[PDB]
């Protein structure tokens, strides 16, 4: 199986730097892009940048230019992220993820970093109107997402993705390219879209479906997430 093994938790002083690692096994390291995602309490998921470990080309979210530095070492099959000039805003869990033909299907377990006590106007904004939804077990739910720009590519695919993050787990890919179910995902789940408006449906909600559902665009840099919709069970 693909394994992305991230380095351990860090507790660091403001103004210092930290460098974390993501060691890849079970696929060819030099073949695929690796992206990095920030999970800050109260602030959902945010995309930092990506790197190609063959070519060493990297692309950054403007928000993290001069904060984050991505490197890769093909001898150790390891991707690295360095964060400089640390502040309280940098306290978060940081994930690496393998980009498989635009699917972030494989995720590291995350590295926790805790720090002691007008740009981005072109970004595609992803809106999840409902921060939470409560469902009786066995009943259906729909979860909405919209984008500020069409996610339709000239190739005819729509680069919208749905992830589920179960409590204490890394995000997991559920739906890729708007409507396609990831391997192992039950047919209770579906994705639809109609212009810039997307809908995840669950036909009958079960206990294992509890967690936070995020939409994400992989059309154009910087990649962007919705703020998340937390699915909880409703108790009679």
């Amino acid at each position: 199986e693909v394994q992305l093994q991230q380095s351990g938790a860090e507790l660091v002083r403001p103004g210092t730097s930290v460098k974390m690692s993501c060691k890849a096994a079970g696929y060819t390291f030099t073949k695929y892009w690796i992206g990095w995602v920030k999970q800050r309490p109260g602030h959902g998921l945010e995309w930092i940048g990506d790197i190609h470990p063959g070519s060493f080309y990297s692309n950054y979210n403007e928000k993290f230019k001069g904060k984050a530095t991505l490197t890769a070492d093909t001898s150790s099959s390891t991707a690295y992220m360095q964060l400089s000039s640390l502040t309280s805003e940098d306290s978060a869990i940081y994930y690496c993820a393998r980009d498989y033909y635009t699917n972030y299907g494989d995720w590291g377990q995350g590295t926790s970093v805790t720090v002691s006590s007008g740009g981005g106007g072109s970004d595609i904004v992803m809106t999840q109107a409902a921060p939470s939804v409560s469902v009786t077990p066995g009943e259906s739910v729909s979860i909405s997402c919209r984008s500020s720009k069409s996610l339709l590519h000239r190739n005819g695919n729509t680069y919208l993705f749905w992830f589920l993050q179960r409590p204490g787990q890394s995000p997991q890919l559920l739906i890729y390219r708007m409507s396609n179910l990831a391997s192992g995902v039950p047919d209770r789940f579906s994705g639809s879209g109609s212009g810039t408006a997307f809908t995840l449906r669950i036909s009958r909600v079960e206990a294992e479906d509890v967690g936070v559902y995020y939409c994400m665009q992989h059309l154009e840099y910087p990649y962007t997430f919705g703020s998340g919709t937390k699915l909880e069970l409703k108790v009679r």
Binding site: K31, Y32, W33, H52, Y57, D99, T102, L219, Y221
Partner: peptide, 8 residues
């Protein structure tokens, strides 16, 4: 797979 960007 493009060497310079991950964008489709």
């Amino acid at each position: 797979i493009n060497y310079y960007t991950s964008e489709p």
